[PDB]
From a paper:
The autosomal dominant monogenetic disease neurofibromatosis type 1 (NF1) affects approximately one in 3,000 individuals and is caused by mutations in the NF1 tumour suppressor gene, leading to dysfunction in the protein neurofibromin (Nf1). As a GTPase-activating protein (GAP), its primary function is suppression of the Ras signalling cascade by accelerating the GTP hydrolysis rate of Ras, which returns Ras to its inactive GDP bound form. The ubiquitous Nf1 isoform-2 splice variant Nf1-23a (2839aa) is, together with Nf1 isoform 1, which lacks the 23a insertion (2818aa), one of the two biologically relevant alternative Nf1 isoforms. Our high-resolution single particle cryo-electron microscopy (EM) structures reveal the domain organization and structural details of the full-length Nf1-23a isoform 2 dimer.
Three major dimer interfaces between the protomers exist in both states. The N-terminal HEAT helices contact the terminal C-HEAT helices at the other protomer, each contact burying about 950 Å2 of surface area. The resulting dimer is connected in the centre, forming a core that buries almost 3,000 Å2 of surface area. The Nf1 HEAT/ARM dimer framework is rigid in its core, providing a stable platform for the GRD-Sec14-PH domain rearrangement while retaining high mobility at the peripheral tips of the two lobes. The disordered, S-rich region branching out from C-HEAT helix α103 and returning into the core at C-HEAT helix α104 could not be traced. Flexibility and solvent access are consistent with the reported target for phosphorylation.
Numbering used by the authors:
A (entry chain N): 4 to 455, 482 to 620, 674 to 795, 831 to 853, 887 to 1121, 1134 to 1191, 1845 to 1953
B (entry chain F): 1954 to 2458, 2601 to 2745
Write the structure that this text describes.
Amino acid sequence: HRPVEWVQAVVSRFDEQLPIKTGQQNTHTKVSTEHNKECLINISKYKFSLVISGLTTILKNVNNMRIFGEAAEKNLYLSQLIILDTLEKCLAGQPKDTMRLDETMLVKQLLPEICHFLHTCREGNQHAAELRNSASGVLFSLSCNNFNAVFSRISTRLQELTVCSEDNVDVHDIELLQYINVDCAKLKRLLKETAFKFKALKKVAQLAVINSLEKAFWNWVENYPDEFTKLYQIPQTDMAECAEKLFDLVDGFAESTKRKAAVWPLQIILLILCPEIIQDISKDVVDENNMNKKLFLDSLRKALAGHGGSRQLTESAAIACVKLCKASTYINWEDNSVIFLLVQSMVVDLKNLLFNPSKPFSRGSQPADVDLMIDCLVSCFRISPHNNQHFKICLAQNSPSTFHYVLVNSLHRIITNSALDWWPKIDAVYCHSVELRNMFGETLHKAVQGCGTDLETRSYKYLLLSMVKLIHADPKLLLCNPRKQGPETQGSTAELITGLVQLVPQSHMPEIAQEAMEALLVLHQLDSIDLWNPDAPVETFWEISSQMLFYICKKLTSHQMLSSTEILKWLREILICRNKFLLKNKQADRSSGTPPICRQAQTKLEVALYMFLWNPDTEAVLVAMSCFRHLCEEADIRCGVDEVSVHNLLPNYNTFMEFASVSNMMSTGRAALQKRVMALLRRIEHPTAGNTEAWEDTHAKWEQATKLILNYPTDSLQEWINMTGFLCALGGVCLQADTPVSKFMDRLLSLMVCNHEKVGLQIRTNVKDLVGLELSPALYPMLFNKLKNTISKFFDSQGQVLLTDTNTQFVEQTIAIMKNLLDNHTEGSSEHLGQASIETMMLNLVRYVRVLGNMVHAIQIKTKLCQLVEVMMARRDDLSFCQEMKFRNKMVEYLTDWVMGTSNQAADDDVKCLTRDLDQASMEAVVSLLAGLPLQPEEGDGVELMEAKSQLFLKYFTLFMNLLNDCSEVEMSRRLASLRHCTVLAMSNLLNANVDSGLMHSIGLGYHKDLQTRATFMEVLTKILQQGTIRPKDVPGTLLNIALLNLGSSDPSLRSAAYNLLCALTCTFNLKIEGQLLETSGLCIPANNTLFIVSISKTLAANEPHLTLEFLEECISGFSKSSIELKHLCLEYMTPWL
Amino acid sequence: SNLVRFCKHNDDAKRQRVTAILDKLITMTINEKQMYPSIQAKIWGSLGQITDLLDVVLDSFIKTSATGGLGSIKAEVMADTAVALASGNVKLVSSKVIGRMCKIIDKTCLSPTPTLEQHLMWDDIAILARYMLMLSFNNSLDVAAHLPYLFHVVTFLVATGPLSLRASTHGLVINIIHSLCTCSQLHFSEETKQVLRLSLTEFSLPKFYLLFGISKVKSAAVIAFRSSYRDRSFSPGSYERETFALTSLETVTEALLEIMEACMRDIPTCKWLDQWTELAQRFAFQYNPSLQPRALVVFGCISKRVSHGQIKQIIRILSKALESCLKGPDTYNSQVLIEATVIALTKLQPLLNKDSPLHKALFWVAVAVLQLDEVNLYSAGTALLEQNLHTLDSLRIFNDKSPEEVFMAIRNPLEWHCKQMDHFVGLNFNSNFNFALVGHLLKGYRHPSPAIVARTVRILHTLLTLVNKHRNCDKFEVNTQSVAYLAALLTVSEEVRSRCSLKHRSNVLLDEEVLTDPKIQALLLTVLATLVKYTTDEFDQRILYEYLAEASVVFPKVFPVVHNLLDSKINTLLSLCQDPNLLNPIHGIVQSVVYHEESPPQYQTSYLQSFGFNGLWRFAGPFSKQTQIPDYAELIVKFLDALIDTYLPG
């Protein structure tokens, strides 16, 4: 129930992926839509009827579909091609069930749609050629079983034509005989049926049956060779009788010379079928039985010898005789019948007609019928293979080119199509190898010269292509009788390879270049390696094979070619195919040699496998990466032990393995892929000849490409980016005054300020992007020194800034480079940040921005520089500082000047609301700078150091306080909330480092007016007390009043912070109270906290008197500042002290 | 300072006069804001040192606050004033504000309500809680004597009320612990005090803010207190109120129990834990739909001894809870009295006698609860099951017998009621024990919480290691008994996948030498078909289809019972899938089906209904959004009733 409905899905998905049907991009790289086909083919074996019927309707629907346009036609052509190919595989795949009860589908559903293509179908000169070729194979497979169905249709058409007397030209039904599979018994039926009805047919019908019946003979002979032999082995009267009756009818039909020309090819086939009539023809002739036959046979020879003055018959006699010669080959000749004798009579005459160099036999438009000559020569070879005498005629150099063209193609069929075993084989021709090679050399010499008469030149290219395909089919044919290397001259196997190699990078003759690749790839199989030099097969291979690599690799690097991505896919397999010969060679005998060429050619392979990583084509880069395994796996074979050599012969062995994994990833745009390549390119630790010359060679290309982009007043640019990214990530290898690496930087820095109207903007956007996020961590110490020196000359003598519009563009870029550079944490960077001193550059950077002025533009620079100084204080442990503290003070000096509040209201422009952000940004810089910083005053004037600091501390304290008062909400809520929070955190860090010099100035924060700010100063003060265990140990009484005053507050988060301060005091100073106190966070302390305070104060006063004087002095001072309600409290706990 | 005599003036109606004077004094305090620090020290500080007068003074505080309301100023101020009153006699105001709370809660039984907040007496409870918050600081709630009665109320209030009342309960706990660390009446060794201080820090972590229900609150103190509490009354809003989960209450309830026991180690012959238990045991077994569920989750979490007579009551509160659900239209009300009865049993079994029948008959309560199809009831059912196996091991009951033998032997006396349930649930326990006990454990994979998924995987391993150990078969052998638990563990346990590998890539699952029974191989295919019908994951669908292709060939005859289960999802995959890894095995399935066609189907799709398991694929569906009792719960009530009658006669 369900499974039938499961198949429908497999069928239904088939329709929706036919190009004419909307593609919808469901191919999924064609892997998903191709898998469905295989299922459809497999299912057909058990549900043959269902699948086939489904397929016909898909074909019928496509036929009755009208579409216009160049896209439209191409889609439907490719659409119908897939259906037919699939449909044939189902028929062939199906086991020989031989169920002949498929009549229902064949008669109506299937035959009419297959028959449609077999018509001329002149819509496409190239398309219809394939459809007939593909469709015919379907009809042949179908005819195997259901012969009666096809055969019945033909019988009807004959009867219709027979009775009717108005001649019609719709003979296409008749012409199906050319394709239906035929057997001996079936063939008899065709002859008998046509014999009865032949006489009454019209003229046109008679010709079609004759031609089609003629081609029917060859299908039987090829497909059933054995049955043909038995025909002559044992007599069969029935076969002879039917042919004889048909023979006479055809002869009666043909009277004119034009008619005789048409029918002669067939008549010989019929005569061949009746053997004994030939014998009698040789001897005395019967009155009528063998009278008509003998007249015809001798009439043939006259024209074959040129005696008659009729050209048309001369051409026809040629065709007829050739078929007789071809048919003879199948007869074993053990019978030695007259067939062999009859051919011998005509062979000598035939050759002089077809193989006379003086006179070229020209059947028609072509200068000579090239196909016909191939049939003759191939057949004659099989009859008399021992010493052919016309092989030499063609093989001779003086003979015309077409004779050469016929010779190789003739040798091409011998190798590829030899069904019968007892025939001779190609081995007999090996003796002529020496002459074959010379022909290759001369044709190669003249073919290349022409590219760099009209048809003579074109002739050579066709001959050259055929020669290359020959080496592809069989390489031993041309390698026999090797010359062996002369003392002063190269060998013969070498000269062959050098000729084949120089065709690969041509691109003048793309078809040949593709073929020479396959030819050179077959001479590398383990079988064919031996033949190069049988004396020593493991010494000439590396001498030549390696020397081929050196030639091809040097070509790829030199310049870009259209087919570069295709030579690379071939070059991968050469590497696969020369590892195996090294693997097996080493196993049998290590002894494997490494002459200088093996080194001088191993380098150039690497110098070309780097330079393909920055190639724009995604496929080229992916393939290049996978070619690194085959460079690695060769290392193991030469030396198995890892440590001894695998990291000594190939120093960067470990990273190369990483290239492989990344290649095995889903495809993504060139930008995403370049990120992964540049990561791996950055881990090449060890200098090598391959690295240090892939860097220099691609630098010279980079330098010249730049001039073209700039000087000339998108694909051109994208390459410029890729060469730059590559040439930065891989800088470290070539490292180690004037040098190629240093000149890269200078030119690189002279492009951050590149003012070019045409494309200037895109250059700067990318040089900033790369030098920051992609430079190699081995070049920081050199980037900083050059970046510093460029700046230092912005200041004239006596330290006066020289504003210039470009100088302002350079500083804005040096900030974005530095920020990205520092912000990113990567492997190995840390060790290198240390070498250089970044201080002197940072100090000079602010002064220039300090003098820039005020405007919407210059303010945003001030913002970003402040964010850089924040990031430079998260990496302070990594960096190197000559004088850390003396440098952090000046920055605080230079940054406080920019924090100016309420300047956007006086400016009266909301456009300058940014100034709020500059104050927000400046403080975050000053928090980070101050965290842990002792104060140190510049010794420009002579004052006591201790006094000097206290003056300094008050300078910043008042500054923060003033900015704090403005931020009060009563005097944007988020802005003020954050800025106020920062301004207290900035103040806390200032006090912690400098308790000794700044505690006195700071006590006034205890009674500040902002409740949220009083809690923080108390937490800071709790922290300071515990770290230890006016100095903080000399004012126990001054703090104790702050704790007790703020315990009665009205802010629930200011009571708890005050409870904790009280706890620190008793432990730190051993104050004795009644109960116990335990520091904590999260307590909910009640508001009516009055009798608690009075109880602590009463106790301390009783048995802690020495605090009295300093306690009361503060309590009175705290009375005035507090409010009315808190004033009543201060009375309550003050009295116990009096 | 002289009202002592008048307060008990022979009830001559002069007593009515003093209360008027106090009510007048209360009004000065509300209005004279500026003189507040000085009224407290003089009027209330000193008036609160007269023992005989404390009872009447306190009473007026509550009455004045009552009229204002929970957020009213009059009630807000009287909460603060009690701090000064209580400083004179901590031992007397504490044991009189606590004693009123414990009684208001005890009167909610009379007119039970779906929740406290809808009760009439709610407003009385809310204000009395603000008194407890304020008195807790500095040990003015005498913990050294009232710790039992403070935890008892904390557990009945956690995560109830407006967000102001929820930050108050958190603060109250932080103050009871702090008072312990800084109390002199108790003498805690230096070992104990380290335990307390870690507890003090833990409770302030973002973990416990979530348990109390005040996540998204930066600090609790701020929300608990309001600055302008004298000028204006509180203005509650955002009535949207989070829910509470009885699993949260255990995590808190055991955090407190850890604290208390540390103290009892030092305090000799302490009675704290025996007093707290008595308070819980009184609300646990008394009908009050607002307090009963919480008083069961607490009764079991702290109790140290349980008897048969107690267990019968717990299991008969579960029988009446089910009956109400189907009778009435109010469901959620009584679907939390069930989840609480199950959570108690998970804790009280490990205390039962070593030789009691119920140690084994609590495997059918766990099973009969998974059959109710609710995410919470399912989650609680496994936790009772998982520990039922763990407990029986430590009692060494699976030594010479197999799971099927133990649990199916005790079910025999009450087989008649059990038989009918199996008919409707569509699984059978007489036919095949180990396949009906995995139908219930395949729904676990559909639970929203990723923590109940891993608990059902552990319950599979622990069952697997017990069936094989009965046969001494290395814990990964494949047999008729131990094949169900390996199909379930196939897609989650790597050691199962490697040690049981598909033949057409040790021993290979699907062996036809041992799995030579038509029935035992019809079931094993429904388990594999089911696991993919609802699964949605590439890694799972890959592994499960490769085992179904190989099943198509090795078991040609019985495979047609797996079409409708595979029918729909494959049909969709064929049309639209674009994965070579996942599209290969599906093709292998289609080809095998057509090949082995051309024969009259020997086994139809309804082959499983014949011998019981017609519901196996249905019981593993997703949990229904339309939460309702499956309505064959009328039989679970009779089963539970017979279980009690047979094993707890009286």
